[PDB]
Structure formats: C-alpha cells, structure tokens
Design a binder for this molecule. Structure first.
Ligand SMILES: [Cl-]
Ligand SMILES: [Cl-]
Lengths: 126, 136, 139, 121
C-alpha cells in the first residue's frame, strides 16, 4: 500500500541518516536525524555525542502499527585503504508515528514534510 | 436484519481469511485480507509473510466459526476455533478456541481497485482486529 | 530493493502533489510539483493556475479533489506507472474516477535547486514526462 | 498527574506479570500479559515464551508520550539471587470495547504495550 511505501521510505532514510559516518556530511546527517526524531528520541540521540561508514538497506518490514524492522549493512572503510573495508549486518527496531508538520520548525518541515517522527530506535547485530 | 446478515457475513469472511493457513488457498486468503482491511490492518496481517517459508505446505490451520455477534456501533465479536494439523497425518490435530474483536465500517467503494470492488462492492473495511483466548 | 522503495515513494508523492486540489494544501502542493519537475513539466502544471483561466480562481475553496493511490509499478528505464483514484466533491461521497499516470523520471544533480528544494528533495528526483490516461483495465 | 499515576501503575503491573516466574500463577500471568499487550506484541511474547522468581519494582519513569522506563529487580529462590534490570516499554491506550470482555475486565482502561525490551543495569 501507499502508507507502507511511505513508511518504508522514511524508515530507510532514517537509518541512512543515523548510521552513516561521513565527516563532510555529518553535521547535515545529525540535523536530519533530529528533524525525523521525536523530541525525546532527538534528545537521546544528541546524548551519544578519517573512517567512512556507508549503509545498505536490505529490507524493511513495517508492522503497520508504528513499529518497523530494518535489516541493513554498514561498510566501514579506512579512507586510504583500497577496497570497501569491513561489512557487518544489523537490525534496527524502530517505533514511529506521524505528527502534524505545522508542529515543527519551517526548516524541519522542508526536510520532513509528512511529519515522520521516530519515537524509539534500537540497533542489534543480525 | 439485512445489516446484521451483511455484517455477520463479512466478519466471518474476515476471520476465515485472516486466521486460515493453507498453502493452496493462501494467495486468495492473503488477497482477501488486503481488500477488506484498512492499510494499517492490511500491513499488520501481511507483515507476518514478509511464516509461509517457515511452514510451506506441511502445516494446515483451518477455522471453524462458532458464533458471530455484531455488538452495535461498528464492533463485532467472532468466536472461533483454529485447528492445526501437520499435513501428513490423519487425526484431529490441535484445536484452540479464540475471540476476535473487530472494529469495522463501510467505506466508499469507488476508492478501491477493480478486483477489490468486484469482491467487496459494499466497502467492508476492518480498522481494528484483535484476537484473545476464549474464557467465560 | 531500496531503489524500488525510493522510486515508488517519489512517484506517489508526485501524483499526490500534482492531482490534488485542496485550497488548504494548494500552496504546498504547487511548490512540491515545482521542486520535483523539469522546467517543462513544472510549467505545464503551473500554467493551469495562470492567466484569467486560473483553476483556483474558478474553484476557490468550494471544491476539493483528493487522491487515492492504488498501485505503483516502476517499469524500469526511468518510467513508472501509478494507478490512482481522484475524488471530487463540493464543500455524500462526491465523484470518483480512476486514472493511470505514466511518468518519465530521473535523479539529477541535487545542487541545482534552491536550498528549499534541496532540503525536501535531496536525492534529486525529477519528472521529465507526465501523462494521465483513463483506467481501462487490462487486455 | 493522574495520567502519570495511571501509567506507572499499569507499567508496573505489566513488568510484574511478564517477569515473574511462579508455577501456580504462570498461566494467569501469561494471560495477563496478552491482555495488556498489543496484538503484535502479544504474538511476539507468545513466540518467545518457552524455582520461583519474584519481581521488585524500583522506579517507573514515563516520558509522557508513550515510552516508560521501569527499573526493577528479579529474585530467584535463604535469600536467592537478585539481578537488576531496565525495561524500556512503548505503550498507548485503546478503546476497551476493541478487546474481549475478559480482556476488558482485566484491563479496563485498554492499556496496551506495543514494545518491550529488558536490559541489564
Ligand atoms: Cl516526511
Ligand atoms: Cl529526494
């Protein structure tokens, strides 16, 4: 369905924003994560604060009631090695809902026009 | 009355589709749940198959509807048994009893796809579905 | 895969923005079509709210056309098909018709947009052809 | 607030029901967890379900928006072994008519846990 397509896109965007490490996009990624997170999950993410980690989304299963499961890989390279480096696999378990986009900043609403908000997020090894 | 007959038919069709596991009806059962559900309930059902490659065609769970009570104001209660047999075997398998409580309405049927509107021209639509064990 | 998810998201967002007529979301819809479209396609949409013909002048606040997305199939080679319903009523159920949008699309360099556009569309989704035909079923 | 008093009570009841091990009450406890759980969380609990362990609630902090943190101890049985834990619990309230009559007698306010995770302290 369309609501599923929607949720799968934003769950995927969230994991990419939150799990990537890229020096030159990190301020932008950090900001994106706050704009897609509820106030308390945003406060909780802020409290966890050259290599490059890239994310591959493998699959996403929303339960249709505000939990989603995202299987994904992270590939961490020392920038100044040749290959793609070490790849590990993970499962994000993500609570989320949609808020009134008027109830956020104007900038937040441009980044997050549907008002998608992660309310909880946990990552476990696959 | 006619609303009661209509509602009782659909509640039972919903429980049968949603609670049956049979490899040879599965595609049809799966599509019926989709046509008859809100997107959230649809996805709630469908997400358990995103179970069939766990069970394949070795397990069959069939439903027996025991009573159907529409409770007024778009809620209905369906008592039913589910019976699971490994597909090899004669024997009765294991039977458990359940109560599905079901929030439902009739939506604009024009919004649905072609095939959905043939099967569900009245727009039966489940917005909440919950199964609890049978007690008193 | 992820590309399918991305494509299907943007294809539907496009059809919702472009086919919806709702006074209270019109300014946002209009702007979203602009961000997601080629100059041609953008002006093709925008042109219907210009001159004395402007659709909003001739509807105002008294008509609402809402969209239900029914299926989205990316067809490969940057073409996608969105089946959808449009439901119009003046402010019962109003009038529902079914439609097929065929959409040529690509991902362009996202720096070429105003920074507003790049916040909303950082991947650079860009529609270069848009056509709606009536639903006929299959055969 | 009252909403907080309410949430602390049901969150504490949930952890008591879900983390206690008592042979003579295990079936009632199992049933209680189902009646206090969303449909999906009830399915998930039932799958993962496979001495006497008693629960002591130490504190309950709801965030006011559907997440609660419960710090608690489990004591298995002189004294026995006590370990310490943190349940992170998502929850909401649903219309009590959307559940069975029996469910609704155990859970009159329609409290539903939508997610549950326990971590060591
Ligand atoms: Cl959004
Ligand atoms: Cl984008």
């Amino acid at each position: 369905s369309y609501d599923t397509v929607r949720d799968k896109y934003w769950l995927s965007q969230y994991v990419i924003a939150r799990e990537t490490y890229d020096w030159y996009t990190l301020q932008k990624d950090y900001e994106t994560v706050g704009m897609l997170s509820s106030p308390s999950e945003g406060q909780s993410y802020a409290s966890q604060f050259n290599v490059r980690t890239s994310v591959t989304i493998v699959s996403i299963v929303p339960n249709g009631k505000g939990i989603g499961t995202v299987r994904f890989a992270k590939t961490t390279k020392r920038t100044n090695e040749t290959g793609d480096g070490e790849t590990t696999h993970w499962i994000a378990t993500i609570g989320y809902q949609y808020v009134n986009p008027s109830l956020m900043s104007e900038s937040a609403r441009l980044t997050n026009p549907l008002g998608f908000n992660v309310t909880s997020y946990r990552v476990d090894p696959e």
